[PDB]
Amino acid sequence: PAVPTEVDSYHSLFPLEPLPPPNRIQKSSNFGYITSCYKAVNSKDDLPYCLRRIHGFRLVNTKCMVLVDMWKKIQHSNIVTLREVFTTKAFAEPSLVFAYDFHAGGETMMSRHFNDPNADAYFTKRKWGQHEGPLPRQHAGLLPESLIWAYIVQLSSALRTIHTAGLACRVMDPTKILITGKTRLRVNCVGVFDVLTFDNSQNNNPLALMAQYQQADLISLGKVVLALACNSLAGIQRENLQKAMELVTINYSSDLKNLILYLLTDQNRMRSVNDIMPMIGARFYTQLDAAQMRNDVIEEDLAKEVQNGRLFRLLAKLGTINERPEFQKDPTWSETGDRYLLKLFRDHLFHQVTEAGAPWIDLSHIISCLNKLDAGVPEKISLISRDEKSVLVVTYSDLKRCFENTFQELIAAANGQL
Amino acid sequence: PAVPTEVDSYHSLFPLEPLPPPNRIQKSSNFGYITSCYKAVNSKDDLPYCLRRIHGFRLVNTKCMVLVDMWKKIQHSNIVTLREVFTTKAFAEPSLVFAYDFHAGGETMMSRHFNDPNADAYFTKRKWGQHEGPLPRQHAGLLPESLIWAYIVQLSSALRTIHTAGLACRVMDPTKILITGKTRLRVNCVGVFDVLTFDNSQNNNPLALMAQYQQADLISLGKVVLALACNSLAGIQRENLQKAMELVTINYSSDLKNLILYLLTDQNRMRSVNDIMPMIGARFYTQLDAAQMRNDVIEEDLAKEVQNGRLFRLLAKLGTINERPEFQKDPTWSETGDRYLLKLFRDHLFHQVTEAGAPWIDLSHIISCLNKLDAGVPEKISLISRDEKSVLVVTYSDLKRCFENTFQELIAAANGQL
Amino acid sequence: GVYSELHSVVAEVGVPVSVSHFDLHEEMLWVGSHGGHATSFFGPALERYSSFQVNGSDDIRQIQSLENGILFLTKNNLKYMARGGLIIFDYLLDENEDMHSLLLTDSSTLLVGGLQNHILEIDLNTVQETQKYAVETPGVTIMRQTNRFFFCGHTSGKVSLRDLRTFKVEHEFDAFSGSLSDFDVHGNLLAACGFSSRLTGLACDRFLKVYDLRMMRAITPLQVHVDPAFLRFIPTYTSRLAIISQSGQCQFCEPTGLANPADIFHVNPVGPLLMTFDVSASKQALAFGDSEGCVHLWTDSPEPSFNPYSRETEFALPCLVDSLPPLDWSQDLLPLSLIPVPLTTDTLLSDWPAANSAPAPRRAPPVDAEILRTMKKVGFIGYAPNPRTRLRNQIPYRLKE
């Protein structure tokens, strides 16, 4: 109730992240301002959108919308695509809200793989006058190198797409990647620095610093990948660069070695990501095969319940057809009318009881008769009234004819053709 | 009468291809012997299998079982996995049955693509003397280049995963590649020549000619993909090779022509799979992206249907709860009881009419209200009685609670627990 | 040649049988009561096949068995219906016509008549009256057809022989000065029984009026020891005349012989009154429907075939409840597809149009302030008078144009 639930088309807000208190003068260090995260639902399209709220920030210049348009034109599987950004005032302060979709179960790189201080303990520990023994070639907790390779593949593809679009992520930080499921990655906070550090000082040409931002992206990527290799952010420090290099030498392949060399030790040039494409080599296939096998599992699983929306909409039609008051007067639904069979059919389906008078309910029997009716099998079934005054044996196909005709009549009456 | 019912552990054998007549002395052109195809079911693990029967054979040397073991350890996505091999005499002749794991819906290269003779009529039946003018820029039958690049990716990955195990598929051919679905590929008839053409000529070393076999595999792959490019098997002919090259040059990509040149032209070296990798380039990621989009489709469909099934459970309860003669005695079914409200809810679900009173048939009202019901949403619902006297405001949570109690008491009574 | 009791059944308790008719295509028999409820029975085991109310008011007066279905006759309707109860067609007759008599001339043409002075010839497949023939003597309740003439029995006590094509009256017999109870035609002989008017009034005539079709004249009437309300020629060996009295006393006689009291047997001498009677085409079964709704079968064979060429009669299997695997309703996670599902290629029965298949948001509106104020809570129910500003289950959603 403290937060105004309604914002334009958005409703039913719920806080997602640990909310920074309104008295928290400490701005988030990732962007230099106070940020909060929530989820809402759009009334324009009935689609859910997570929202990111800034504090105390003012939309000064309008030129950024060109880049925001590029953000909206940019879509990718492993990116949390930018859909919209806007100003709000219903809150305690004028704020800027970024509306993305929500992906439940997203978990950051720290929370998934960097939540243990013991992973950092190797770098943080200092051997105080103690001989440094050989490092365990099987470091406890070491990830399969394939996972590292997969993460590299995803981030590299993201960088490729963004540079092809001619934009800069400037968000290469494990804090802004969510591992949906097991391997699927999601880069986060797209355009937030684009608006926060947006300036007009660059002679009304924002494209001046794009190459610098790209090189910063790649250097940050090298540091992140090294931290991934060390399963510890403490390795990316300049003091531990050589320790990280020797750990890479001890544990992982020359491919990863050359990677970190090529990146950490800059080539004093506008390095092209294409230059690193062959380096991954044959591991690409292992990745793609893994994906394909995941597909092969789920597609298989699909066939288990293909018929259920079918059969639900079946009983939906049943409910919208039976127990219609407007028909209780029509003699065509009386015991002398042709449609009394429908009433008797419903009574056999639901109202059938045991010989001892106990209620007789059997979902399997229900389903089986449903299957017979859906097939329209030439099997004949018997219909008995409550008092056994009148009994009729009829094939399922005539049931099909009667139900289709009655539903067609109801549709025509609903649509004004009667 | 030519198909025995039970062969070893397989029964229900159904011929899958038009079987050659018993008077067809002509050995199959693809395998050099009499061939037959059947679909059988395992009696042990109850699984579908495809049976390829070869005629007129007796085991010469048993060393081929090592190769068969190699295939039994080979598990690749795009390969028809070979399950077992055995000897049978239930047929008129002692025959060999290959049991592979079974997939439906396979359409071969020719069946999907080369089935159009006019696609071959470009290479064939030309003017043969009339001035051949400029080639039509849109050659009929041009495939999506993304699709053909995906096909070459799958083919190359299959070849490499085979070669790393020290074997040769040697069966790659248009007629021997099926297309499960639309793009996913499957290569059939694996591990056959290992026994069919099994000789101790190579010093009892089956791997003596592995390099020759793999280079022939590369050559045949090149021919296959050239046919794929031309939509005409006449293209792969030596006398149409130049026209195939020129058409591919006019139409498709430079990386594609260069790959064709590498694969087909003998480069006097043991050509390596790694060698072709850089020339596909970004198309690698483009394929992976398309795959992830298909993933995001299928998972969505699952998320629909499973929920619809859980809803069906509810509707079933509704069906067994409405209008029973025993509930006619049950005070809860009466108006003073809660279950009359369930009755009224049924009325609100199916008996909706317009402002003019005309019947309103629409799935969306029903589905939304039932989602509110099963979720037990705190959103209220005003239920106005049939006799139009009272309006009752009840939460969907309360409606769900009373309805669940109704159904569970009814089922307990029917089972006799009450 | 001696018919004895095989079985007796109750079509309807306390409601008289108003007409009965063996099905000539199957081992079936149809019994209609005066109250409008009809029931078919199978075999000597008298087993009920189908049972339902054919019409709410009009009693049933004739049942006709056809190859494709069953024709039911009431006072103001003609219903052609399937053996299982599906209505084939329903030809409503004029209320001004006391519909009584059917005549299946062939597979598709029916002659319908009664106390009215006209007989309607109707084509069944078209469900249309094709001809209307006038009758100078209304009251034709008995109708029979042989290879030579139409035999019309009139309530005036006459029998008219009419041409099979033009329907014009060719020959007439004044069998009785009062009323006609029954008449039958076989080969070269016609036997009629009925009521005549004497000084004491209208009473049943014990002298059967027997006419020779060969020489076209009445022959010596056959004096009987009962009150003949029905006559029927049984051609087992000779043309035995099954003389039926409503009191239950029935008799065998010869069409030209002498009535022998030793040929007198009793169906229901005490109690029920014989109302309806028929003989199987095989001459092996006899049915009497009485005034209590009871139908009695006498057979000269222990297990006769109602027709020597009788086709199979199908029976419906009961629901096979125990064969399916049990599924716990409280268990919402079990795979429901364990139930066998046969497949058919035709379009799914209930498929929905695109317009009615589109989902949308349907957020329910809040309560009216008026309702909130006037709503009094009683336990868990909300008791609030209807505002009367909406329709019954009017759409709570504002439909987009």
mmCIF file with all atom_site columns, C-alpha atoms in Angstrom, chain A residues 11 43 46 303-308 310-311 313-314 316-317 335-338 341 348 360-369 371-377 379-382 389-394 398 400 403-404 407 411 415, chain C residues 12 37 49-56 79 83-87 314-321 324-329 334-337 339-344 346-353 356-358 360-363:
data_model
loop_
_atom_site.group_PDB
_atom_site.id
_atom_site.type_symbol
_atom_site.label_atom_id
_atom_site.label_alt_id
_atom_site.label_comp_id
_atom_site.label_asym_id
_atom_site.label_entity_id
_atom_site.label_seq_id
_atom_site.pdbx_PDB_ins_code
_atom_site.Cartn_x
_atom_site.Cartn_y
_atom_site.Cartn_z
_atom_site.occupancy
_atom_site.B_iso_or_equiv
_atom_site.pdbx_formal_charge
_atom_site.auth_seq_id
_atom_site.auth_comp_id
_atom_site.auth_asym_id
_atom_site.auth_atom_id
_atom_site.pdbx_PDB_model_num
ATOM 1   C CA . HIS A 1 11  ? -1.349  -3.043  -11.914 1.00 0.00 ? 11  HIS A CA 1
ATOM 2   C CA . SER A 1 43  ? -3.463  -3.678  -19.604 1.00 0.00 ? 43  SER A CA 1
ATOM 3   C CA . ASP A 1 46  ? -2.277  -8.431  -20.890 1.00 0.00 ? 46  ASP A CA 1
ATOM 4   C CA . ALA A 1 303 ? 3.161   -36.273 -26.536 1.00 0.00 ? 303 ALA A CA 1
ATOM 5   C CA . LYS A 1 304 ? 2.198   -37.248 -22.974 1.00 0.00 ? 304 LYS A CA 1
ATOM 6   C CA . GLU A 1 305 ? -0.709  -34.781 -22.761 1.00 0.00 ? 305 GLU A CA 1
ATOM 7   C CA . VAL A 1 306 ? -1.474  -33.523 -26.272 1.00 0.00 ? 306 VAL A CA 1
ATOM 8   C CA . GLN A 1 307 ? -5.192  -34.252 -25.822 1.00 0.00 ? 307 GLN A CA 1
ATOM 9   C CA . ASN A 1 308 ? -5.816  -32.283 -22.644 1.00 0.00 ? 308 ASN A CA 1
ATOM 10  C CA . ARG A 1 310 ? -8.841  -30.800 -26.505 1.00 0.00 ? 310 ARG A CA 1
ATOM 11  C CA . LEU A 1 311 ? -10.719 -32.557 -23.696 1.00 0.00 ? 311 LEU A CA 1
ATOM 12  C CA . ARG A 1 313 ? -12.595 -27.558 -24.219 1.00 0.00 ? 313 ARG A CA 1
ATOM 13  C CA . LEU A 1 314 ? -14.809 -30.625 -24.655 1.00 0.00 ? 314 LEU A CA 1
ATOM 14  C CA . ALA A 1 316 ? -16.354 -26.635 -21.616 1.00 0.00 ? 316 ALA A CA 1
ATOM 15  C CA . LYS A 1 317 ? -18.809 -27.203 -24.450 1.00 0.00 ? 317 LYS A CA 1
ATOM 16  C CA . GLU A 1 335 ? -39.363 -36.823 -22.606 1.00 0.00 ? 335 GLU A CA 1
ATOM 17  C CA . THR A 1 336 ? -41.260 -36.737 -25.917 1.00 0.00 ? 336 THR A CA 1
ATOM 18  C CA . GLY A 1 337 ? -38.662 -34.533 -27.606 1.00 0.00 ? 337 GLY A CA 1
ATOM 19  C CA . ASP A 1 338 ? -35.625 -35.689 -29.546 1.00 0.00 ? 338 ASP A CA 1
ATOM 20  C CA . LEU A 1 341 ? -31.486 -38.276 -25.052 1.00 0.00 ? 341 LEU A CA 1
ATOM 21  C CA . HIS A 1 348 ? -25.618 -41.542 -17.345 1.00 0.00 ? 348 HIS A CA 1
ATOM 22  C CA . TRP A 1 360 ? -20.966 -44.166 -8.695  1.00 0.00 ? 360 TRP A CA 1
ATOM 23  C CA . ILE A 1 361 ? -18.150 -41.908 -9.895  1.00 0.00 ? 361 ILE A CA 1
ATOM 24  C CA . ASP A 1 362 ? -15.279 -43.136 -12.069 1.00 0.00 ? 362 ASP A CA 1
ATOM 25  C CA . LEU A 1 363 ? -13.022 -40.670 -13.875 1.00 0.00 ? 363 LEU A CA 1
ATOM 26  C CA . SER A 1 364 ? -11.635 -43.508 -15.981 1.00 0.00 ? 364 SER A CA 1
ATOM 27  C CA . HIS A 1 365 ? -15.147 -44.475 -17.079 1.00 0.00 ? 365 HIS A CA 1
ATOM 28  C CA . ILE A 1 366 ? -15.809 -40.815 -17.813 1.00 0.00 ? 366 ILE A CA 1
ATOM 29  C CA . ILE A 1 367 ? -12.678 -40.549 -19.921 1.00 0.00 ? 367 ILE A CA 1
ATOM 30  C CA . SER A 1 368 ? -13.357 -43.798 -21.751 1.00 0.00 ? 368 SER A CA 1
ATOM 31  C CA . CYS A 1 369 ? -16.874 -42.795 -22.726 1.00 0.00 ? 369 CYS A CA 1
ATOM 32  C CA . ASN A 1 371 ? -12.978 -41.110 -25.976 1.00 0.00 ? 371 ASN A CA 1
ATOM 33  C CA . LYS A 1 372 ? -15.711 -43.246 -27.505 1.00 0.00 ? 372 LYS A CA 1
ATOM 34  C CA . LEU A 1 373 ? -17.837 -40.175 -28.184 1.00 0.00 ? 373 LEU A CA 1
ATOM 35  C CA . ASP A 1 374 ? -14.924 -38.193 -29.603 1.00 0.00 ? 374 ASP A CA 1
ATOM 36  C CA . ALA A 1 375 ? -14.180 -41.077 -31.944 1.00 0.00 ? 375 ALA A CA 1
ATOM 37  C CA . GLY A 1 376 ? -17.839 -41.594 -32.781 1.00 0.00 ? 376 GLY A CA 1
ATOM 38  C CA . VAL A 1 377 ? -17.315 -45.362 -32.606 1.00 0.00 ? 377 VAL A CA 1
ATOM 39  C CA . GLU A 1 379 ? -20.372 -49.033 -30.303 1.00 0.00 ? 379 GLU A CA 1
ATOM 40  C CA . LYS A 1 380 ? -23.876 -48.803 -28.848 1.00 0.00 ? 380 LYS A CA 1
ATOM 41  C CA . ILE A 1 381 ? -24.560 -47.539 -25.330 1.00 0.00 ? 381 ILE A CA 1
ATOM 42  C CA . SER A 1 382 ? -27.697 -47.762 -23.186 1.00 0.00 ? 382 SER A CA 1
ATOM 43  C CA . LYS A 1 389 ? -39.587 -45.393 -17.108 1.00 0.00 ? 389 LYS A CA 1
ATOM 44  C CA . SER A 1 390 ? -37.899 -45.168 -20.511 1.00 0.00 ? 390 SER A CA 1
ATOM 45  C CA . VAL A 1 391 ? -34.605 -46.670 -21.714 1.00 0.00 ? 391 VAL A CA 1
ATOM 46  C CA . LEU A 1 392 ? -32.923 -46.225 -25.111 1.00 0.00 ? 392 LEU A CA 1
ATOM 47  C CA . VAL A 1 393 ? -29.864 -47.866 -26.676 1.00 0.00 ? 393 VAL A CA 1
ATOM 48  C CA . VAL A 1 394 ? -28.062 -45.665 -29.210 1.00 0.00 ? 394 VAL A CA 1
ATOM 49  C CA . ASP A 1 398 ? -25.867 -40.218 -33.046 1.00 0.00 ? 398 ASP A CA 1
ATOM 50  C CA . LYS A 1 400 ? -22.127 -36.784 -31.900 1.00 0.00 ? 400 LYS A CA 1
ATOM 51  C CA . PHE A 1 403 ? -24.316 -32.514 -29.801 1.00 0.00 ? 403 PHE A CA 1
ATOM 52  C CA . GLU A 1 404 ? -23.011 -30.849 -32.954 1.00 0.00 ? 404 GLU A CA 1
ATOM 53  C CA . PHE A 1 407 ? -24.093 -26.486 -30.258 1.00 0.00 ? 407 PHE A CA 1
ATOM 54  C CA . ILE A 1 411 ? -23.946 -20.579 -31.639 1.00 0.00 ? 411 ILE A CA 1
ATOM 55  C CA . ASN A 1 415 ? -24.707 -14.716 -33.063 1.00 0.00 ? 415 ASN A CA 1
ATOM 56  C CA . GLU C 2 12  ? -47.650 -51.357 -18.326 1.00 0.00 ? 12  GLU C CA 1
ATOM 57  C CA . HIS C 2 37  ? -46.131 -45.600 -23.531 1.00 0.00 ? 37  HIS C CA 1
ATOM 58  C CA . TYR C 2 49  ? -35.641 -54.105 -25.757 1.00 0.00 ? 49  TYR C CA 1
ATOM 59  C CA . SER C 2 50  ? -36.738 -50.467 -25.678 1.00 0.00 ? 50  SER C CA 1
ATOM 60  C CA . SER C 2 51  ? -39.410 -48.575 -23.766 1.00 0.00 ? 51  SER C CA 1
ATOM 61  C CA . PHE C 2 52  ? -40.507 -44.953 -24.016 1.00 0.00 ? 52  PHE C CA 1
ATOM 62  C CA . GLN C 2 53  ? -43.463 -42.580 -24.194 1.00 0.00 ? 53  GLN C CA 1
ATOM 63  C CA . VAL C 2 54  ? -44.469 -42.188 -27.826 1.00 0.00 ? 54  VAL C CA 1
ATOM 64  C CA . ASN C 2 55  ? -47.092 -39.483 -27.246 1.00 0.00 ? 55  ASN C CA 1
ATOM 65  C CA . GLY C 2 56  ? -48.500 -37.902 -24.120 1.00 0.00 ? 56  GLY C CA 1
ATOM 66  C CA . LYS C 2 79  ? -44.271 -41.507 -35.811 1.00 0.00 ? 79  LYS C CA 1
ATOM 67  C CA . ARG C 2 83  ? -35.615 -49.320 -33.094 1.00 0.00 ? 83  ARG C CA 1
ATOM 68  C CA . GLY C 2 84  ? -33.321 -47.670 -30.560 1.00 0.00 ? 84  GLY C CA 1
ATOM 69  C CA . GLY C 2 85  ? -35.560 -44.628 -30.157 1.00 0.00 ? 85  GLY C CA 1
ATOM 70  C CA . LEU C 2 86  ? -34.132 -42.063 -32.579 1.00 0.00 ? 86  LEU C CA 1
ATOM 71  C CA . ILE C 2 87  ? -36.953 -40.274 -34.379 1.00 0.00 ? 87  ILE C CA 1
ATOM 72  C CA . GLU C 2 314 ? -27.896 -56.980 -31.657 1.00 0.00 ? 314 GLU C CA 1
ATOM 73  C CA . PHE C 2 315 ? -27.526 -56.376 -27.927 1.00 0.00 ? 315 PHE C CA 1
ATOM 74  C CA . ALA C 2 316 ? -25.786 -53.434 -26.283 1.00 0.00 ? 316 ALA C CA 1
ATOM 75  C CA . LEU C 2 317 ? -22.906 -54.137 -23.947 1.00 0.00 ? 317 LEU C CA 1
ATOM 76  C CA . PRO C 2 318 ? -23.052 -52.583 -20.472 1.00 0.00 ? 318 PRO C CA 1
ATOM 77  C CA . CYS C 2 319 ? -20.316 -50.211 -19.381 1.00 0.00 ? 319 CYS C CA 1
ATOM 78  C CA . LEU C 2 320 ? -17.039 -52.038 -18.689 1.00 0.00 ? 320 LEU C CA 1
ATOM 79  C CA . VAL C 2 321 ? -16.260 -50.242 -15.444 1.00 0.00 ? 321 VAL C CA 1
ATOM 80  C CA . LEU C 2 324 ? -9.937  -49.308 -16.586 1.00 0.00 ? 324 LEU C CA 1
ATOM 81  C CA . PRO C 2 325 ? -6.974  -48.471 -14.312 1.00 0.00 ? 325 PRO C CA 1
ATOM 82  C CA . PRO C 2 326 ? -7.901  -46.559 -11.145 1.00 0.00 ? 326 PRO C CA 1
ATOM 83  C CA . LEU C 2 327 ? -6.993  -42.864 -10.983 1.00 0.00 ? 327 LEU C CA 1
ATOM 84  C CA . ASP C 2 328 ? -7.157  -40.929 -7.717  1.00 0.00 ? 328 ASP C CA 1
ATOM 85  C CA . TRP C 2 329 ? -9.039  -37.653 -8.067  1.00 0.00 ? 329 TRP C CA 1
ATOM 86  C CA . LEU C 2 334 ? -0.891  -38.637 -12.176 1.00 0.00 ? 334 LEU C CA 1
ATOM 87  C CA . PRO C 2 335 ? -0.640  -38.937 -15.989 1.00 0.00 ? 335 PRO C CA 1
ATOM 88  C CA . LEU C 2 336 ? -4.252  -38.987 -17.129 1.00 0.00 ? 336 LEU C CA 1
ATOM 89  C CA . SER C 2 337 ? -3.431  -40.513 -20.533 1.00 0.00 ? 337 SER C CA 1
ATOM 90  C CA . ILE C 2 339 ? -6.908  -44.498 -20.364 1.00 0.00 ? 339 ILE C CA 1
ATOM 91  C CA . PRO C 2 340 ? -7.035  -46.101 -23.841 1.00 0.00 ? 340 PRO C CA 1
ATOM 92  C CA . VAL C 2 341 ? -7.903  -43.685 -26.620 1.00 0.00 ? 341 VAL C CA 1
ATOM 93  C CA . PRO C 2 342 ? -8.975  -44.991 -30.028 1.00 0.00 ? 342 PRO C CA 1
ATOM 94  C CA . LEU C 2 343 ? -8.302  -42.552 -32.846 1.00 0.00 ? 343 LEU C CA 1
ATOM 95  C CA . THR C 2 344 ? -10.504 -41.304 -35.666 1.00 0.00 ? 344 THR C CA 1
ATOM 96  C CA . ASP C 2 346 ? -12.597 -37.051 -38.932 1.00 0.00 ? 346 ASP C CA 1
ATOM 97  C CA . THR C 2 347 ? -12.723 -33.477 -37.675 1.00 0.00 ? 347 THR C CA 1
ATOM 98  C CA . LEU C 2 348 ? -13.066 -33.255 -33.928 1.00 0.00 ? 348 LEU C CA 1
ATOM 99  C CA . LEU C 2 349 ? -16.724 -33.206 -32.968 1.00 0.00 ? 349 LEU C CA 1
ATOM 100 C CA . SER C 2 350 ? -16.767 -29.996 -30.958 1.00 0.00 ? 350 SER C CA 1
ATOM 101 C CA . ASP C 2 351 ? -14.190 -27.740 -32.676 1.00 0.00 ? 351 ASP C CA 1
ATOM 102 C CA . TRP C 2 352 ? -14.760 -24.008 -32.136 1.00 0.00 ? 352 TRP C CA 1
ATOM 103 C CA . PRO C 2 353 ? -14.958 -21.076 -34.548 1.00 0.00 ? 353 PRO C CA 1
ATOM 104 C CA . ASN C 2 356 ? -15.515 -17.875 -30.276 1.00 0.00 ? 356 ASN C CA 1
ATOM 105 C CA . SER C 2 357 ? -12.011 -19.304 -29.757 1.00 0.00 ? 357 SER C CA 1
ATOM 106 C CA . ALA C 2 358 ? -10.221 -16.054 -28.833 1.00 0.00 ? 358 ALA C CA 1
ATOM 107 C CA . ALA C 2 360 ? -9.154  -12.066 -23.588 1.00 0.00 ? 360 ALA C CA 1
ATOM 108 C CA . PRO C 2 361 ? -8.861  -10.394 -20.171 1.00 0.00 ? 361 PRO C CA 1
ATOM 109 C CA . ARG C 2 362 ? -12.128 -10.663 -18.238 1.00 0.00 ? 362 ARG C CA 1
ATOM 110 C CA . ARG C 2 363 ? -11.441 -8.951  -14.900 1.00 0.00 ? 363 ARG C CA 1
#
